[PDB]
Design a protein around this ligand. Structure first.
Ligand code: CLA
Ligand code: CLA
Ligand code: CLA
Ligand code: CLA
Ligand code: CLA
Ligand code: CLA
Ligand code: CLA
Ligand code: CLA
Ligand code: CLA
Ligand SMILES: CC1=C(/C=C/C(C)=C\C=C\C(C)=C\C=C\C=C(C)\C=C\C=C(C)\C=C\C2=C(C)CCCC2(C)C)C(C)(C)CCC1
Ligand code: SF4
Ligand SMILES: C[As](C)(=O)[O-]
Ligand SMILES: [Ca+2]
Lengths: 106, 80, 734, 163, 41, 142, 64
């Protein structure tokens, strides 16, 4: 924001736009997803924010409406076979199927 | 060793003895209100000077003060 | 119970640990808490200690003179003092390689050598010396006097020679003898030296011992002193173009008061200092006749302090009962002496870079900064010691019965107000100084130097204009001509002063820019914070609100236990700890300021300082990162040079600093368990259980831990800064 | 003319610095078309930079041999001249605001010493009371001096000391 | 509502409301009034 | 009747550790504790791990005195068990320390006379004047 | 009948006491007879967190 001369931080990076250079590595990570215009990141952020709201909802729900018992928490068998198999295996298969059907543009 | 003193400012709460880790001080006759005990230091050959008895003493100001002196095998907590 | 080393501790003797060794090496000079150390058996020991330390000083100076005479190139310096540099000593280290002998051979007349930064050549030649034999003589003399003091310290130990106790309490006669004899008479002897040798040596005359029996130091010799007209000794001073090694335009004046600089040598006139020390000696002699003695009436001390009592009760008893208070306490006199010594050490450091007394001294650009920083840190430590002993007074030697109504009790009573106002001034200085520095840094980071704040120090510039400066044009005393201060003293010292003050190249009332404002305020912050720490440690000594009975546990005790929500570093010794940290900081800021001022001045670009001394990025870039290239390049795969040893010492200083942090961050309790583990391991090693350690290994005392931590801190700080100040200066010459 | 400093318009170094800044701005201003956003941003930046350099040089502020402005802080040199705004009135403005703040905070912390468990009021403030006292302190110099003559601010030595 | 207004007297209130008011005021004064370093007179 | 030390007493079942029992225990001193311990049970050692304890009086021993006061206090904590202490010097002489009164120093026993104390308000001590002797740490009354 | 009325607030003059020159109500002046009869109660904590203490009758004094 132009206030006290801080706008000098808007380094001339080209692309018809000036700003602060980022070293987080998000542009290279997004290029691997076939994004062609800015119109997609808006919807992606909308989805992420809805999921975060639902996440806080689930937290409140399992603390004040569905507070579990130690019998459920201590299901090491279930916790493993659902983290190891589901949370990891299903996610990896979904992301592999994604990379398979997005390998055309890149 | 560690010169330990006990002043007349005392109520006999029996706390600085159930807190001392080396069983150094005793509580023998005192004319009090409900408990009537006063602390005393009959022996100091084993007192290390940890100042754990000064933390539990609720007297204002404290009834016991450890005058730090010279060190020894007992005073340095040396198993060797 | 079990007798062993040392001989002056029966409680520390039964101690089965290495702790007693450290406390013996430490408390060997504490001659007041030892077993059976009554007063009258202590003054003689402290007096023998004075003799021993004086012997140490004289032996130090004798060794310096000896290595200057034999290994130093003093002959190579007197003739052409500009084309040559000093030499300190040689090297027999077998570890050097062939390139090393070729790198430490600046002289050329011998093997490896080391430059002399003591500034001894200038001071030894200004007083008059042009032969190495004259140096051997003085070195031998100092060794002899050292031996004499070593013997005198012992002589007063056996009977028939042991003094009494009433001989010390007689402060009147002793102070008379010191004000008159120790100061006045010696100053008059020094005037005689300057008028009989220093001046003749300034005329290139080879006047020494073998010829001064008939040399007239002044035409009409000693007659004006008999027949009046003292002014006859100030009628032909050193000519403006006077040569100092020869008599190129000399004079016969001895008591001169023109008050200027010797152009060739760039120092005060060798004849001004004679009249200087003569007036000083006369005035100290006048001062030394003030007291009551056996038959000399004068006026005694007990009747003076008891008479200084304001009738309105603003002070109460005034100064009644302070004679018996001070005279019966040595820590108070030691505190006063150390305070005076530190303040006058700072004063001498201030007066040596501005009024050079030594011929051919200001031309040298390395010994100046070294000696200035030397005296600055010496004065800092001496002031910290003064405050430490001031606190020891309240801890150990104090009788409030005798002191019911004096000014000291009043000072102790409102101690909270003093501490609070010190805290407030410190907060003010820190807040505003750091705020202006951060503001200038942020403004420079945005690329608009015009938006920074630069307070114009009108006050110091005004005082300079009053001194005679005209660069600022305030039309003041000694700058205008409608004032009695400018008119009176026109044939006096005024011409030389006014000619040396407007010079924009010498160090005398430098051109002050707004960048000096900020650094003077940083120095004020440092001084106020160090004084806050010391005054707080001293006033809250007999007893504080957290620890009311602090007078019972002495001075240096670790803590009062983890009770009462935590009690760490509560003893006054710990306040001294932190105040020594702040002393290091304050003296370091002062030295950075002085060094970088004269560094921007010597490159002919004082505008560099006037423009970059406004923010902190400049201090980091333009001073620290910049003027160190020879420290990094002292040794490299390309090949080292003379600046390699100084770089290795610059790294040694950082190593000592980090070891100080080692002893500071990690505390004792952690190391006790590790030492017990190491003992377990050492007792069980197969066939390694032979002859044991003689004392049990334990962790250093908390007091010892922080003492050694601060010692490493200070020594590494000093070595690093000194290695920098020497290498980055005596390697580039610019 | 004070302290050897010269008014900041006649400083060749000051104008050289302004030209340097403008050249440094334009060299990277020429990278963009006159229609894009960064170009307008640099245009406005140059606008207020030229405004910096123009507006300073009014009523007189001394720049030294470096060309940069130097604040004069002595009352008396700001008088007999036109420098009373460098730092003379800002001093009084800060004193006014700091008074205001301390007065309000003190009267708050005093009016809370009367009710039970005042400690709570220091972690759970009385917002309406703080707002009321916030809009009543802009006469504090009047209240301070006469509350001093009153004596309702000196505690009659009934505090905890050790000596 | 009542317990909420009571909660609104802690760190998450003035200390936030305050210093937000102040940052906003200072930023606005420095924005409309671009670069002050000395008073009008 | 304060009981004295008795050698050849059985010990609890335990494997070993690396705590205490050093050269100090052989040539300087070692401390002993004895206590009832009915209802064979599991306990924790102050310089080791967990161990079992038969019923009937059993005796232990460690290096430092606190290493046994900790066990006495533990025994207070859970089930009311009443151990004792012992001292040993180089000459083999044994001294009984805890509890001499038999009633656990925290509680008074019928009557004794203590030392190292003075009837004076906190503070109000003597200034460093007239304390030049300094006798290490002064009792202020002797 | 010995010490001040119970419920009446009084100050402290124990030189070595955290609570000094400030007022505190009396819990119960010990009538059974002892050197520290007056038990004063203070709302603010000390470095140790204790609220009450017993003092001598030659030390306490009147109200502000
Ligand atoms: C016009 C009448 C007059 C006046 C104005 C004075 C004034 C004074 N007399 Mg005097 N006197 C008078 C008549 C007078 N006298 C007469 C008629 C007699 C009989 C003949 C005497 C006999 C007499 C004696 C015997 C002595 C005096 C002394 C003094 C001085 C100390 C008094 C005092 O209370 O200090 C003030 C008390 C203070 C506590 C001031 C506090 C100072 C603060 C704390 C300094 C702050 C430090 C801070 C870091 C610095 C920042 C500075 C900041 C303010 C900018 C004082 C300046 C005494 C003296 O000389 O000094 C020892 C003394 O010995 N008088
Ligand atoms: C760079 C390190 C550092 C810094 C910054 C300080 C700073 C300070 N020291 Mg200190 N000191 C240090 C190292 C340091 N010390 C070390 C290593 C030692 C030895 C271990 C000591 C030992 C020491 C002693 C014994 C004493 C001090 C004291 C002080 C204070 C004096 C107050 C003052 O003069 O005005 C102000 C100084 C400031 C630093 C204020 C600047 C801080 C700004 C305002 C931060 C603002 C942040 C921003 C507003 C929001 C950030 C917060 C959050 C959002 C993250 C001061 C705050 C003295 C004291 O307490 O004063 C009464 C005191 O007596 N120091
Ligand atoms: C990660 C989950 C996932 C999902 C939701 C899909 C979904 C789909 N795949 Mg696919 N596939 C996946 C993983 C997945 N695949 C993996 C891991 C592989 C590697 C073995 C393949 C290899 C594959 C091929 C070769 C083809 C599909 C095709 C298809 C599409 C129609 C065929 C079908 O219904 O199945 C459909 C939208 C067909 C297609 O592209 O539609 C024309 C097709 O030809 N997939
Ligand atoms: C004043 C203190 C002082 C100090 C710090 C030194 C230090 C040093 N001296 Mg020296 N010396 C001194 C006084 C001092 N000296 C005096 C007063 C004399 C006159 C008797 C001498 C006469 C002397 C000679 C003749 C020599 C040294 C040498 C040395 C160096 C090596 C010493 C060695 O290894 O040989 C043995 C150490 C014995 C303790 C060393 C750096 C030697 C050297 O290498 O010159 C640099 C050497 O040749 N010294
Ligand atoms: C143990 C080795 C050793 C010893 C005994 C000495 C001894 C001495 N040095 Mg020396 N010095 C040394 C190593 C040593 N130095 C090293 C490695 C360097 C870096 C190359 C220097 C650089 C140095 C300089 C620049 C000066 C001395 C000077 C001196 C003399 C004055 C006292 C002093 O400064 O103390 C020792 C100093 C540091 C330990 C003294 C006799 C001064 C002199 O000229 O003598 C009159 C002097 O100015 N030294
Ligand atoms: C004119 C006579 C005279 C002179 C020249 C001196 C000179 C000196 N005395 Mg001395 N003194 C004198 C008379 C004199 N005294 C008398 C009459 C007494 C009896 C009261 C004393 C009692 C005395 C003591 C107790 C001590 C001295 C000490 C000293 C030395 C101080 C340290 C130093 O380096 O000086 C100053 C350095 C630069 C200015 C110094 C050289 C001290 C010393 O060092 O012991 C030898 C010391 O402890 N003197
Ligand atoms: C302790 C200091 C000191 C000492 C020991 C001497 C000693 C001496 N001076 Mg000397 N003098 C001194 C200080 C001293 N002076 C000072 C400070 C001045 C400056 C005023 C003089 C100015 C002076 C003159 C002008 C003369 C002497 C002369 C002499 C010598 C014979 C005259 C005499 O003193 O009778 C004699 C050895 C006379 C002489 O013949 O010189 C050798 C002589 O002409 N002095
Ligand atoms: C050369 C001139 C001179 C004169 C006239 C005097 C005269 C006097 N001196 Mg003195 N003195 C002098 C030089 C002189 N001194 C010098 C140069 C020194 C330095 C060594 C001293 C050091 C000195 C001391 C230490 C003392 C005197 C003392 C005295 C007085 C004792 C005699 C008396 O009782 O009166 C008939 C006396 C009035 C005594 C005195 O009165 O105390 C100050 C005393 O103890 N003088
Ligand atoms: C510690 C604060 C301080 C300091 C160091 C100074 C310092 C100075 N002031 Mg100043 N002044 C101050 C406070 C201070 N003032 C305050 C609070 C006011 C408001 C009343 C003034 C009002 C004032 C005026 C009106 C003048 C000065 C002037 C001066 C300069 C010459 C002194 C003088 O007045 O002539 C001599 C002093 C005789 C006692 C001088 C550098 C004069 C100046 O501008 O220099 C040319 C000038 O005319 N001052
Ligand atoms: C801790 C303590 C202590 C210490 C103290 C101290 C450390 C002090 C100090 C101090 C100081 C360190 C001081 C200083 C100062 C200063 C002054 C005192 C000044 C002044 C002034 C004047 C008068 C001057 C004038 C002038 C002239 C003459 C001319 C020119 C100008 C001028 C200005 C310079 C004791 C032991 C004691 C006690 C106890 C406590
Ligand atoms: S802990 Fe203190 S108050 Fe309690 S009985 Fe022991 S000495 Fe008395
Ligand atoms: C002292 As004048 C030269 O002003 O008369
Ligand atoms: Ca000059």
């Amino acid at each position: 924001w132009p206030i006290v001369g801080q706008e000098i931080l808007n380094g001339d990076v080209g692309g018809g736009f000036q700003g602060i250079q980022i070293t987080s590595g998000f542009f290279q990570l997004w290029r691997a997803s076939g994004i062609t215009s800015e119109l997609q990141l808006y919807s992606t952020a909308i989805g992420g924010l809805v999921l975060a709201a639902a996440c806080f909802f689930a937290g409140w729900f399992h603390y004040h409406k569905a507070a579990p018992k130690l019998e459920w928490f201590q299901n090491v068998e279930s916790m493993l076979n659902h983290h190891l198999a589901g949370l990891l295996g299903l996610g990896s298969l979904a992301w592999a199927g994604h990379q398979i059907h997005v390998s055309l543009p890149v | 060793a560690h010169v330990v003193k006990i002043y007349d400012t005392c109520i006999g709460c029996t706390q600085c003895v159930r807190a001392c880790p080396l069983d150094v001080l005793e509580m023998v006759p005192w004319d009090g209100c409900k408990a009537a005990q006063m602390a005393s230091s009959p022996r100091t050959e084993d007192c290390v000077g940890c100042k754990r008895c000064e933390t539990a003493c609720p007297t204002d100001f404290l009834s016991v003060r450890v005058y730090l002196g010279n060190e020894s095998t007992r005073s340095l907590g040396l198993a060797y | 119970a079990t007798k062993l080393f040392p001989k002056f501790s029966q409680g520390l003797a039964q101690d089965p640990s290495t702790r007693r060794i450290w406390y013996g090496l430490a408390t060997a000079h504490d001659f007041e808490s030892h077993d059976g150390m009554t007063e009258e058996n202590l003054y003689q020991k402290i007096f023998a200690s004075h003799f021993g330390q004086l012997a140490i000083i004289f032996l130090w100076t004798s060794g310096n003179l000896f290595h200057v005479a034999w290994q130093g190139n003093f002959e190579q310096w007197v003739t052409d003092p500009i084309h040559v540099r000093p030499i300190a000593h040689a090297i027999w280290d077998p570890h050097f390689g062939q390139p090393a002998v070729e790198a430490f051979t600046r002289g050329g007349a011998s093997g490896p050598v080391n430059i002399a930064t003591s500034g001894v050549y200038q001071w030894w030649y200004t007083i008059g010396l042009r032969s190495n034999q004259e140096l051997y003589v003085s070195s031998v003399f100092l060794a002899l006097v050292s031996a004499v003091f070593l013997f005198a310290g012992w002589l007063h130990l056996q009977p028939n020679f042991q003094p009494s106790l009433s001989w010390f309490k007689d402060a009147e006669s002793r102070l008379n003898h010191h004000l008159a004899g120790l100061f006045g008479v010696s100053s008059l002897a020094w005037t005689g030296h300057l008028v009989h040798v220093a001046i003749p040596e300034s005329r290139g005359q080879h006047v020494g011992w073998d010829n001064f029996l008939s040399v007239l130091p002044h035409p009409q010799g000693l007659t004006p002193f008999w027949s009046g007209n003292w002014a006859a000794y100030a009628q032909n001073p050193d000519t403006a173009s006077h040569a100092f090694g020869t008599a190129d335009g000399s004079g016969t004046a001895i008591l001169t008061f023109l008050g200027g600089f010797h152009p060739q040598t760039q120092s005060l006139w060798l004849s001004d200092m004679a009249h200087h020390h003569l007036a000083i000696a006369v005035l100290f002699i006048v001062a030394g006749h003030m007291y009551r003695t056996n038959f000399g009436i004068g006026h005694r001390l007990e009747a003076i302090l008891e008479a200084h009592t304001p009738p309105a009760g603003g002070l109460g008893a005034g100064h009644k009962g302070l004679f018996h208070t001070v005279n019966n306490s040595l820590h108070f006199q030691l505190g006063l002496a150390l305070a005076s010594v530190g303040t006058i050490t700072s004063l001498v450091a201030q007066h040596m870079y501005s009024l050079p007394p030594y011929a051919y001294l200001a031309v040298d650009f390395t010994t100046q900064a070294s000696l200035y920083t030397h005296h600055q840190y010496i004065a800092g430590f001496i002031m910290c010691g003064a405050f430490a002993h001031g606190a020891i007074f309240f801890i150990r030697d104090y009788d409030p019965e005798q002191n019911k109504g004096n000014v000291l009790a009043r000072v102790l009573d409102h101690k909270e107000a003093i501490i609070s106002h010190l805290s407030w001034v410190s907060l003010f200085l820190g807040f505003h100084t750091l705020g202006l520095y951060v503001h200038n840094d942020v403004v420079q980071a945005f690329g608009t130097p015009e938006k920074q704040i630069l307070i114009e120090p009108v006050f110091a510039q005004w005082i300079q204009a009053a001194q005679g400066k005209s660069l600022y044009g305030f039309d003041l005393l000694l700058a205008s001509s409608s004032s009695p201060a400018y008119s009176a003293g026109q044939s006096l010292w005024l011409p030389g002063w006014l000619e040396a003050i407007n010079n924009n190249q010498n160090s005398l009332f430098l051109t002050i820019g707004p960048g000096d404002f900020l650094v003077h305020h940083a120095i004020a912050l440092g001084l106020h914070t160090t004084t806050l720490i010391l005054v707080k440690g001293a006033l809250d000594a007999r007893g504080s609100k957290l620890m009311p009975d602090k007078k019972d546990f002495g001075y240096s005790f670790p803590c009062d236990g983890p009770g009462r929500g935590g009690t760490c570093d509560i003893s006054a010794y710990d306040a001294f700890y932190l105040a020594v940290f702040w002393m290091l900081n304050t003296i370091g800021w002062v030295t950075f300021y002085w060094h970088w001022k004269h560094l921007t001045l010597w490159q002919g670009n004082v505008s560099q300082f006037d423009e970059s001394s406004t923010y902190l990025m400049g201090w980091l870039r333009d001073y620290l990162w910049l003027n160190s290239s020879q420290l990094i390049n002292g040794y490299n795969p390309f090949g080292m040079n003379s600046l390699s040893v100084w770089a290795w010492t610059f790294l040694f200083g950082h190593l000592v600093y980090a070891t100080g942090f080692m002893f500071l961050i990690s505390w004792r309790g952690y190391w006790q368990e590790l030492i017990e583990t190491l003992v377990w391991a050492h007792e069980k090693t197969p066939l390694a259980n032979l002859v044991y350690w003689k004392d049990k290994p334990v962790a250093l005392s908390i007091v010892q831990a922080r003492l050694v931590g601060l010692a490493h801190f200070s020594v590494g700080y000093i070595f690093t800064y000194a290695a920098f100040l020497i290498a980055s200066t005596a390697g580039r010459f610019g | 003319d004070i302290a050897g400093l010269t008014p900041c318009s006649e400083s060749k170094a000051y104008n050289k610095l302004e030209r340097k800044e403008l050249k440094v701005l334009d060299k990277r201003l020429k990278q963009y078309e006159p229609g894009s956003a960064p170009y307008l941003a640099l245009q406005a930046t140059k606008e207020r930079t030229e405004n910096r350099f123009k507006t300073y040089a009014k009523q007189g502020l001394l720049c030294g041999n470096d060309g940069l402005p130097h604040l004069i802080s002595d009352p008396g040199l700001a008088l007999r001249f036109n420098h009373a705004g460098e730092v003379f009135i800002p001093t009084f403005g800060f004193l006014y605001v700091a008074g205001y703040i301390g007065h309000v905070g003190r009267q708050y912390i005093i009016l809370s010493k009367e009710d039970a468990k005042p400690t709570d009021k220091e972690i759970i403030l009385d917002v309406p009371l703080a707002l009321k006292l916030a809009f009543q302190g802009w006469a504090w110099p009047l209240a301070s001096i006469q509350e001093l003559r009153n004596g309702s601010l000196l505690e009659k030595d009934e505090n905890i000391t050790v000596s | 509502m009542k317990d909420f207004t009571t909660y609104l007297s802690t760190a998450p209130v003035v200390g936030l409301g305050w210093a937000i008011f102040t940052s906003g005021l200072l930023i606005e004064i420095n924005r409309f009034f671009p670069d002050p370093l000395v008073f009008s007179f | 009747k304060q009981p004295e030390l008795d050698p050849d007493t059985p010990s609890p079942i335990f494997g070993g550790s690396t705590g205490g029992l050093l050269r100090k225990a052989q040539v300087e001193e070692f401390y002993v504790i004895t206590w009832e311990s009915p209802k064979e049970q599991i306990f924790e050692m102050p310089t080791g791990g967990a161990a079992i304890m038969r019923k009937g009086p059993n005796l232990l021993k460690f290096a430092r005195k606190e290493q046994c006061m900790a066990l006495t206090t533990q025994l207070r904590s859970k089930f009311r068990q009443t151990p004792c202490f012992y001292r040993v010097y180089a000459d083999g002489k044994v001294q009984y320390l805890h509890p001499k009164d038999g009633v656990y120093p925290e509680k008074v026993n019928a009557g004794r006379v203590g030392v190292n104390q003075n009837m004076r308000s906190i503070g109000k001590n003597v200034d460093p004047i007239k304390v030049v002797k300094f006798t290490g740490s002064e009792p202020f009354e002797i | 009948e010995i010490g001040p009325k119970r419920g009446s607030l009084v100050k402290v003059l124990r030189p070595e006491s955290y609570w000094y020159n400030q007022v505190g109500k009396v819990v119960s002046v010990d009538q059974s007879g002892i050197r520290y009869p007056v038990v004063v109660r203070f709302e603010n904590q000390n470095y140790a967190g204790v609220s009450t203490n017993n003092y001598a009758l030659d030390e306490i004094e009147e109200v502000k």
